[PDB]
Enzyme design. Structure first.
Site, mmCIF file in Angstrom:
data_model
loop_
_atom_site.group_PDB
_atom_site.id
_atom_site.type_symbol
_atom_site.label_atom_id
_atom_site.label_comp_id
_atom_site.label_asym_id
_atom_site.label_seq_id
_atom_site.Cartn_x
_atom_site.Cartn_y
_atom_site.Cartn_z
ATOM 1 N N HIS A 1 0.819 -1.203 0.000
ATOM 2 C CA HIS A 1 0.000 0.000 0.000
ATOM 3 C C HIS A 1 0.862 1.267 0.000
ATOM 4 O O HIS A 1 0.460 2.299 -0.540
ATOM 5 C CB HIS A 1 -0.924 -0.016 1.221
ATOM 6 C CG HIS A 1 -1.859 1.149 1.292
ATOM 7 N ND1 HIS A 1 -1.847 2.049 2.336
ATOM 8 C CD2 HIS A 1 -2.841 1.558 0.455
ATOM 9 C CE1 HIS A 1 -2.781 2.962 2.139
ATOM 10 N NE2 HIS A 1 -3.399 2.687 1.003
ATOM 11 N N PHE A 2 2.047 1.190 0.601
ATOM 12 C CA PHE A 2 2.964 2.329 0.623
ATOM 13 C C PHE A 2 3.816 2.386 -0.645
ATOM 14 O O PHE A 2 4.374 3.430 -0.988
ATOM 15 C CB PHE A 2 3.890 2.255 1.843
ATOM 16 C CG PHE A 2 3.171 2.292 3.163
ATOM 17 C CD1 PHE A 2 2.227 3.272 3.430
ATOM 18 C CD2 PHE A 2 3.459 1.362 4.146
ATOM 19 C CE1 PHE A 2 1.585 3.322 4.656
ATOM 20 C CE2 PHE A 2 2.819 1.405 5.373
ATOM 21 C CZ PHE A 2 1.883 2.388 5.628
ATOM 22 N N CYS B 1 5.715 -0.493 -3.989
ATOM 23 C CA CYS B 1 6.041 -1.845 -4.423
ATOM 24 C C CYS B 1 7.438 -2.256 -3.983
ATOM 25 O O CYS B 1 8.248 -1.423 -3.581
ATOM 26 C CB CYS B 1 5.937 -1.956 -5.946
ATOM 27 S SG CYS B 1 4.254 -1.820 -6.594
ATOM 28 N N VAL B 2 7.705 -3.554 -4.051
ATOM 29 C CA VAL B 2 9.051 -4.075 -3.861
ATOM 30 C C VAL B 2 9.602 -4.449 -5.228
ATOM 31 O O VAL B 2 8.914 -5.093 -6.021
ATOM 32 C CB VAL B 2 9.044 -5.330 -2.958
ATOM 33 C CG1 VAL B 2 10.455 -5.857 -2.795
ATOM 34 C CG2 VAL B 2 8.441 -4.991 -1.595
ATOM 35 N N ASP C 1 1.432 -8.087 13.091
ATOM 36 C CA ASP C 1 0.888 -8.669 11.863
ATOM 37 C C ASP C 1 1.589 -9.965 11.477
ATOM 38 O O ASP C 1 1.929 -10.175 10.312
ATOM 39 C CB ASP C 1 0.989 -7.673 10.702
ATOM 40 C CG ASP C 1 0.127 -8.074 9.507
ATOM 41 O OD1 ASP C 1 -0.654 -9.044 9.624
ATOM 42 O OD2 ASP C 1 0.233 -7.422 8.449
ATOM 43 N N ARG D 1 1.870 -15.455 5.566
ATOM 44 C CA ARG D 1 2.112 -14.591 4.412
ATOM 45 C C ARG D 1 3.232 -13.586 4.676
ATOM 46 O O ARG D 1 3.837 -13.072 3.740
ATOM 47 C CB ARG D 1 0.838 -13.829 4.036
ATOM 48 C CG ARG D 1 0.396 -12.840 5.101
ATOM 49 C CD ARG D 1 -0.779 -11.976 4.664
ATOM 50 N NE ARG D 1 -1.297 -11.238 5.813
ATOM 51 C CZ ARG D 1 -2.143 -11.748 6.700
ATOM 52 N NH1 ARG D 1 -2.580 -12.990 6.569
ATOM 53 N NH2 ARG D 1 -2.520 -11.030 7.745
ATOM 54 N N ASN D 2 3.507 -13.300 5.945
ATOM 55 C CA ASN D 2 4.454 -12.240 6.280
ATOM 56 C C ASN D 2 5.807 -12.739 6.774
ATOM 57 O O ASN D 2 6.582 -11.988 7.372
ATOM 58 C CB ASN D 2 3.834 -11.294 7.310
ATOM 59 C CG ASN D 2 2.708 -10.467 6.725
ATOM 60 O OD1 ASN D 2 2.676 -10.221 5.523
ATOM 61 N ND2 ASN D 2 1.776 -10.039 7.569
ATOM 62 N N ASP E 1 7.994 -8.170 7.105
ATOM 63 C CA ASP E 1 6.860 -7.256 7.223
ATOM 64 C C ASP E 1 6.790 -6.605 8.608
ATOM 65 O O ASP E 1 5.756 -6.641 9.276
ATOM 66 C CB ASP E 1 5.554 -8.005 6.935
ATOM 67 C CG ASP E 1 4.340 -7.094 6.928
ATOM 68 O OD1 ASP E 1 4.480 -5.897 6.602
ATOM 69 O OD2 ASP E 1 3.236 -7.577 7.256
HETATM 70 C C1 6XP Z 1 2.313 -12.214 0.619
HETATM 71 C C2 6XP Z 1 3.332 -11.242 0.096
HETATM 72 C C3 6XP Z 1 3.408 -10.819 -1.228
HETATM 73 C C4 6XP Z 1 4.439 -9.847 -1.705
HETATM 74 C C5 6XP Z 1 5.381 -9.315 -0.845
HETATM 75 CL CL1 6XP Z 1 6.531 -8.200 -1.474
HETATM 76 C C6 6XP Z 1 5.384 -9.703 0.586
HETATM 77 C C7 6XP Z 1 4.361 -10.674 1.092
HETATM 78 N N1 6XP Z 1 4.462 -10.931 2.355
HETATM 79 C C8 6XP Z 1 5.518 -10.197 2.822
HETATM 80 O O1 6XP Z 1 5.937 -10.168 3.986
HETATM 81 C C9 6XP Z 1 6.108 -9.410 1.680
HETATM 82 N N2 6XP Z 1 7.189 -8.583 1.886
HETATM 83 N N3 6XP Z 1 7.659 -8.331 3.200
HETATM 84 C C10 6XP Z 1 8.842 -7.637 3.335
HETATM 85 O O2 6XP Z 1 9.395 -7.560 4.437
HETATM 86 C C11 6XP Z 1 9.471 -6.977 2.092
HETATM 87 C C12 6XP Z 1 10.299 -5.754 2.526
HETATM 88 C C13 6XP Z 1 10.368 -7.919 1.261
HETATM 89 C C14 6XP Z 1 9.895 -8.534 0.040
HETATM 90 C C15 6XP Z 1 10.716 -9.414 -0.733
HETATM 91 C C16 6XP Z 1 12.041 -9.702 -0.295
HETATM 92 O O3 6XP Z 1 12.830 -10.540 -1.026
HETATM 93 C C17 6XP Z 1 12.562 -9.121 0.910
HETATM 94 C C18 6XP Z 1 11.725 -8.229 1.690
#
Ligand code: 6XP
Length: 286
Positions: free
Chosen positions: A30-31, A33-34, A146, A150-151, A164
């Site tokens: 929501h903030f 993308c990764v 949280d 999933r997290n 997360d």
């Molecule tokens: C279900 C789901 C779908 C998509 C993404 Cl991006 C995430 C989740 N669940 C997460 O927790 C999460 N991402 N959480 C994280 O801490 C982020 C910062 C991160 C994402 C990919 C990395 O290789 C390393 C860290």
């Protein structure tokens, strides 16, 4: 706040040390993308990383609060807790959060993947890893708020990292967050402890509740909890003393551990240290 800048200053990454691939999206929050990125270390070497954008957070007050709550993760170090590589500050855009790349993705999708077919032993072992990660965070007085399959993420060696949180906190699968609760914000209500649904307060003991649900997720290989319970009803369902049912492949002693995690009285629930002890014993019978 200069104290915050100072703290951020400890982990700053120069823009020329970071290459972000904005066309390679790992996930959506929501903030922001990764994205896939490469970090150049002081030795000039290339390190694959995940880059979390906070660009949807445009308000300076909101950026400040988010950084303030999250910067503490820089002081954390444990094999079952996601670490922070650094923060890239730039002239245009909100700060970028840089984290180690987790090659195998989130735990829930991993166990749902039918080609993986994780065994009971594999699944309990993942749960044990999460318990050790939470034992560490709890020892630091850090409440996750949280925790859910999933997290958590899995790195190249299949080490589970609680993720997360802090600067990495976001909503990454919107399907499991509902505004049907006292705060009116999107919350993971089906992972929340009864008292959190009632009082809006979160503690380590409500993290223990969520961990119990996470264990249930593990043993069902990523089934959604309470699929036939509406978000309107989750509080009363729990008040009635009802709980998630024992998974087919969950051993009886592990289900008892789950039930202990969901005791109505928070102080009666096991600590994560206790959970590591109990789950370790169960794991080793395999
Ligand atoms: C279900 C789901 C779908 C998509 C993404 Cl991006 C995430 C989740 N669940 C997460 O927790 C999460 N991402 N959480 C994280 O801490 C982020 C910062 C991160 C994402 C990919 C990395 O290789 C390393 C860290």
């Amino acid at each position: 706040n200069p104290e915050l800048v100072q703290a951020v200053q400890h982990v700053v990454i120069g823009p020329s040390s970071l290459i972000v691939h904005f066309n390679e999206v790992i996930g959506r929050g929501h903030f922001g993308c990764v994205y896939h990125g490469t970090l150049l270390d002081n030795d000039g070497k290339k390190i694959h990383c995940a880059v979390k954008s906070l660009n949807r957070i445009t308000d300076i007050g909101e950026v400040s609060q988010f950084l303030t709550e999250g910067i503490i993760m820089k002081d954390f170090s444990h094999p079952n807790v996601l670490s922070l590589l650094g923060i890239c500050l730039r002239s245009e855009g909100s700060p970028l959060v840089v984290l180690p790349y987790m090659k195998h993705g989130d735990l829930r999708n991993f166990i749902r993947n039918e080609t993986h077919n994780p065994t009971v032993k594999d699944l309990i072992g993942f749960g044990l890893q999460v318990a050790k990660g939470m034992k560490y965070l709890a020892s630091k007085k850090f409440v996750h708020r949280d925790l859910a399959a999933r997290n958590c993420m899995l790195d190249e060696k299949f080490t589970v990292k609680v993720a997360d949180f802090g600067l990495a906190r976001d909503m990454y699968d919107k399907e499991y967050y509902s505004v049907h609760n006292k705060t009116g914000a999107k919350l993971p209500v089906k992972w929340m402890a009864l008292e959190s649904l009632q009082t809006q307060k979160f503690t380590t003991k409500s993290d223990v509740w969520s961990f119990g649900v996470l264990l249930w997720e593990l043993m069902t290989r990523g089934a959604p909890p309470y699929p036939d319970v509406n978000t309107f009803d989750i509080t009363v369902y729990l008040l009635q003393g009802r709980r998630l049912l024992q998974p087919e492949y969950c051993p009886d002693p592990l289900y008892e551990v789950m039930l202990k995690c969901w005791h109505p009285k928070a102080e009666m629930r096991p600590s994560f240290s206790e959970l590591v002890s109990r789950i370790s014993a169960i794991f080793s019978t395999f």
